[model samples]
Target: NSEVKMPQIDSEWNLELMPNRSGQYWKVFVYKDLKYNALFTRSLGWNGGDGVFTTGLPDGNIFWSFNDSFYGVINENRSRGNCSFPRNSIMVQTPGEKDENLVWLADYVQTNDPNADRYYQVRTHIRHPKATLSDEKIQAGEIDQDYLYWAGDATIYNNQMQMLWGAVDNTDPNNLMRRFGTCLATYSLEGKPGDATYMKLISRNDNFNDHTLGYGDTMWEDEDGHIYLYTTSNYKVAVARTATRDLGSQWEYYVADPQGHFSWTTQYPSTQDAENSTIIPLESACSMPWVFKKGDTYYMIGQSMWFGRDVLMFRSKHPYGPFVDQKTLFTLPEFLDKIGEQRYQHVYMVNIHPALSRTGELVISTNTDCSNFWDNFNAPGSADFYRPYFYRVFNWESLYDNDAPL
Candidate 1:
């Protein structure tokens, strides 16, 4: 039933698995075990028996919190800081020879704001391991100075050793958003400061959530090496094609038509054409796109964010698409699926690791639920706790006729 074989990664070694949106590879950064305020710090405990614990004793967020312990262990296990972005975080892999070693480029967020229900910002973090979060991240990165007010989406690319990140401009800072289109800037690969570039006000709906990244973002380089970006907004997935050869070059954004869709189309299309067609609705109102290429086809894996714990995959023959139907690539039946179609929910992010299998198939790794904080002080039930986990999916051509959907 399984044709594509997935290699075994020491889950404990796979710190933070993020798709390299800049290219095709995945970025596994060192995790810094830092907690985010009362919301996160409240749960610090031990669940030694059946499952892992995210935080301790319950402070009311018991059901909602992920086991923070696992996150801490993973970070210490790798001897690094947290790889930013969850609940649909993103990264970019560089193209060409360096593509094999991907890097973290950009990230988007949509978390609670002190003044309002939700605030957004595009975060720019350096991939430098030695800088440490205290030096640049909290001090210069302006994370704490912003008052938990940043919650937009972001995409990134690495040029040589320098990195560039892009995001939708937020209206909170200046009160006026002259730079309405996607804004970008370059940073030192080692976490140094650099020049900033803001694109013109190109969006007709600057205020609309469409301009910002509420969740996942995808980037890819075609046969010519020009990068193409696809993101989600307003219950739909959109694509933007950039002609730039490097990540920092000024970008020209083009939005794909709403009707344009994508699916897993086998080189040999599904035999049961009509019946085989599948449409994965907006799992998240903003199910962003994270793209990759294998053989001649391009693949997009992003959130159905609202659905909680679900990852959707779309395939296209061309960067600019009439993308086919979508496939539900991964879901956490244990957590998110348990919520059913109810109310107020959260989900973990699943990114296609910017790496590949021995057979050339793309690699993807993610946490189905939040880190097990309760077990942070306790020992992990399984040694494979932090490694990348995956399933072998059969190609449509091989599965259409067969009843098994593997």
Candidate 2:
């Protein structure tokens, strides 16, 4: 009955089982004689986990987006106080080079008056390769503009290169990090950033009781012409689905009954009405839920944000489960020692890059951040920690029968 080979935890291919003593099933990457590091450096003035949201294009290119990206050079003391974009920015990887090479394509910059309310709003600044402005040009006070305003956390979907962003209102400094709602937008793969379309509202966070369904991390489309969108709020996740033709509107949010079962409900017209939506409980307190399918089973990987220290995986025959089969695939060693330390070396947002994978081996990546309190971003030899790390899941078919543990 299994139509395709399902990937299982290949214990023999992990940190404990691998003979090399790598410390994780997810090993760090090493480029041409150099240790694997962040695509953006202190010199570029943008350092730290870039929200791990990446898109792999059909033409063999990769796009990476950063959440609270900073601009301006770091001083000798490695500090650049309060310097960053209110919204997310982007980077790209050229065809054929893998992770060894990357390009800083565009960034969202604030051009309005700092004293004015509109000053907080952000716009896109596309870099060279057909764009005239450079970082130096921007530093010299030349601002090249784009129409799109800064939106919240985002993830890319489908072959057409569309993206979904969580809308953010930077008007209130306290609410700067909060998602007012969720929006879906698209940009051309071959066109300039100026050509990207504006974001359209998809769901309101007001109706979901205390939980806000704003940040969408993962998306999937089944054969029956249904598209599934998953959003993260607090430690749990909510799902919405619609036909491929009606992706913009005509969506439904998954609602949970008192007995813990779930069903889909249409987006009600009146925002004033209190609508109790369904939120499915995950096996653990996690965020950034990335789900995919293999054979008859669906597998999800979420960052354990609340109580746990590692990224965990769950499997279910159905998408809206009771998603069982929980296991700790990758755990950071430093996190185990200091459970409640100041910055605490956090690592999350784990996602599998399908375009970079092969038959029995799948390529996975995660965003990492550390030295939290201060801007230790340019601290000597600290490049490898803050950037994305690539790992490979090997001997996958062995998991079909040998489910020992990860």
Candidate 3:
């Protein structure tokens, strides 16, 4: 890893630190939370993974999707030699009084491999229904090749839980996985989050990648009767939307003219069209960014645009738009100092899970990982290194600022 020196508080767009009293302005106070962090650390079979996305089930349980996860048993020394990597995994967190309420109740299918002793293969908590032959083989521990569906943003629609998935093409064995398309998976939400797997994969459409930007890293459904997807392209954060609550509808991109005026287009953008978009591209955003709404104010959360390590937030009047009022919530350097550092460590995936929050507090999350994958996953204390760190955000600034002109 490059030894690039970082700052204590790398303020990007230091918005006015307005006061909070349930007033209209953007401000929040964040405190580190260790109790929630222990959920992953002690789950030995499900060591850890990245691309943390949460979707609320109709029954009030939270659905979690993870990517490139390490599964199987961990040794007494906390080493994970007994483990295998799943391209993606899923879990359900039942909302209740205890931190120990979690479920990975998916079926564990044994490996079809003939050579190794008749050892069973690991099953991811969730399985992509439209998995390829190679994908199934690898996930069944029959082969070592990787084909994955890293989940994206999600919400409830048509009385069922819906989420988008990015299909990664494992071109070779060297980990050069390319996320080339999108997939849609719908769940029944019938059974139970803790008792049995409620969200069963009823349908899948792997041909859903129709946008110029790799869409669906984050998604939302507004009061306007449409579902929205935020792109993961570059510094320019654009959005696509489908009017119907039913997915697989034609999506319209938010584009602009030479004067920065905006409009929608069903036609995917050309190179020139991308350059002439409405939003300025100077501000860096995340591929897996989180966007949510409280009343009329929509807040977008992420780690610093690019590789910077500060947890940041932006406020906008609309679900997709000129998300302004940037504020630094917490920084990685601050977290490392508080908890002490580990080998090859870095921080990312800053987000907030609204369904998990208390009345006055927003539950925020960020993930840390070592630069080296196998070494880190197998290393002692790997749980402490690769899992999520959480924060309890108290609204010190305006909880929902209504000052911006619409």
lDDT scores for all predictions?
0.32, 0.48, 0.61
Which predicted model would earn the best lDDT? 3
After superposing candidate 1 on the true structure, give the runs of residues whose Cα lies further than 4 Å from its correct spot.
1-216, 256-286, 335-345, 367-406
> Which portions of model 2 show Cα errors greater than 4 Å?
1-47, 71-86, 98-101, 107-159, 169-176, 191-211, 268-283, 335-344, 371-373, 382-385, 396-406
**What is the C-alpha lDDT profile of model 3 across 1-406, one tens digit per residue?**
2222221221321212223323122344445555566566654456666766677677777888877666655555555555556667777888663556677644445435434532333555444444555655655564233455777777777778777877666765664756666788787777776444467777777677733356667777778877887765555667778868766667888877778787988877764665456242345454355777876777777667666666666777787777776666555543431222343466667666777665545576777776666565455565456666666666623433434543
The estimated TM-scores of all candidates read 0.44, 0.65, 0.80
* Residue-by-residue lDDT tens digits, candidate 1, 98-135: 32222222233333442432123324332211122464
The C-alpha stretches of model 3 lying farther than 4 A from their native spots are 1-27, 97-100, 109-121, 124-140, 143-146, 172-175, 194-197, 210-212, 275-287, 334-343, 399-406
The lDDT, on a scale of 0 to 1, for candidate 1 is 0.32
Clashes of each: 64, 2, 3
TM-score of 3: 0.80
- Candidate 2 per-residue lDDT over residues 282-373, each given as its tens digit: 33556767767877777776767753446566777666555565555555434321112324466666666665554435456666566553
Judging by TM-score against the true structure, name the best candidate: 3
Clashing pairs in 2: 255-278, 256-278
Q: Per-residue error at 23 for model 2, in Å?
A: 10
Rank by TM-score, highest first.
Answer: 3, 2, 1
